[PDB]
């Protein structure tokens, strides 16, 4: 149910808002022991696979923190707060 929360919120993004979201998530520095997903692999991922891939890579809590943070950094803070509260 954090997985579905990420999904919903991502699905609310215009496809322009999405590319941007994806592009900047791919530059966020990560806690030790976690690996970035290369931006190319990232780009050819639909919303659902993107969501799962984040959760597989970073686990549910971290993945949500990451997303929130990339959103806040996008100033999309309704969607940020929704997810935030949703987790």
UniProtKB/Swiss-Prot annotation:
**Tissue range of expression?**
Predominantly expressed in monocytes, macrophages and granulocytes.
How is this chain modified after translation?
Phosphorylated.
Record SMART domains: PYRIN (SM01289)
Classification via CDD domains? Pyrin_ASC-like
Give the keywords, sorted.
Cytoplasm, Phosphoprotein, Signal transduction inhibitor
Disulfide pairs? none
Query: What main location does UniProt list?
Result: cytoplasm
Q: Is Cytoplasm tagged as a keyword? A: yes
Q: How would you summarize the oligomeric state and partners of this protein?
A: Interacts with PYCARD/ASC (via pyrin domain).
Q: What is this protein called?
A: Pyrin domain-containing protein 1
Q: Which organism is it from?
A: Homo sapiens
């Amino acid at each position: 149910t954090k997985r579905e929360a990420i999904l919903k919120v991502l699905e609310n993004l215009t496809p322009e808002e999405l590319k941007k979201f994806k592009m900047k998530l791919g530059t966020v520095p990560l806690r030790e022991g976690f690996e970035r997903i290369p931006r190319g692999a990232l780009g050819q991922l639909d919303i659902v696979d993107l969501t799962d891939k984040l959760v597989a890579s970073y686990y549910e809590d971290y993945a949500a923190e990451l997303v929130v943070a990339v959103l806040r950094d996008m100033r999309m803070l309704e969607e940020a707060a929704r997810l935030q509260r949703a987790a």
